[PDB]
Amino acid sequence: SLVTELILSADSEARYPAPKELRIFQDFVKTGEQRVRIAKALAANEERIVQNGSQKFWERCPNTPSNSGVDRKTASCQRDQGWYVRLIAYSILAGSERPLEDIGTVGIKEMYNNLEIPIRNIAECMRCLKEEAMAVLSDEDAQEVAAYFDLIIQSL
């Protein structure tokens, strides 16, 4: 989160929060209302976000384990899409991508290679979910969400 990172940056040179750190903290606390609005919107519409993203991702990339005829694989893909958008909600709530990084996007390649899932297919799907997140959000909301969606993109 932004607070923990600001403290550990103050901790590193063994000092108090500098003239910028308190300013970033005030920015975070005053944008908190907007962040809570984003989180509420995402938690409300995650179901249709996942459905529309899977629709666009299967219209775009169909050579996937997500649509290889096994319903367990498809249900797992939908659950993973919902989990990742929930992690993006955690990121916008925390003010930093560290809920996304420490849970979703650090061991991502080794894990999804171990699952034998093609990495670029997941990248395509995260791009689909990012586009639908634009489709439901306002301009600042969708910009702040697309931030962490492209974090997921970079991790793949």
Determine which residue in the list 20, 70, 102, 138 makes contact with another protein, applying CB under 8 A. 102
Residue 73, marked binder? yes
Given candidates 51, 55, 68, 113, which one binds another protein under the rule CB under 8 A? 113
DSSP 5-73: HHHHHHHHTT-PPPTTHHHHHHHHHHSHHHHHHHHHHHHHHHHHHHHHHHHHHHHH--SSGGGSS-HHH
Q: Is 79 annotated as a binding residue?
A: yes
In the complex, the smallest distance separating the C-beta of residue 112 from ligand CYC, rounded to whole angstroms, is: 7
Q: Which range in 50-58, 78-86, 113-121, 128-136 contacts its own copies by CB under 8 A?
A: 113-121
Q: Which of 38, 41, 42, 77 binds ligand CYC (CB under 6 A)?
A: 77
| Residue 96 assigned ligand-binding role | no
Rounded CA-CA distance 92/83 in Å is: 14
Q: Is 88 helix (H, G, I), strand (E, B) or coil?
A: helix
Q: Which stretch binds ligand CYC (CB under 6 A): 37-45, 71-79, 90-98, 141-149?
A: 71-79
Stretch 33-92 residues interacting with another protein (CB under 8 A): 33, 36, 39-40, 42-43, 46, 63, 86-87, 89-90
Is 66 a known ligand-binding residue?
A: yes
Contact 99, 90 (CB under 8 A): yes
Neighbours of 92 (CB within 10 A): 24
Main-chain phi, psi angles of 69, to 5 degrees: 90, -10
Among the candidate windows 27-35, 38-46, 113-121, 130-138, which touches ligand CYC by CB under 6 A? 113-121
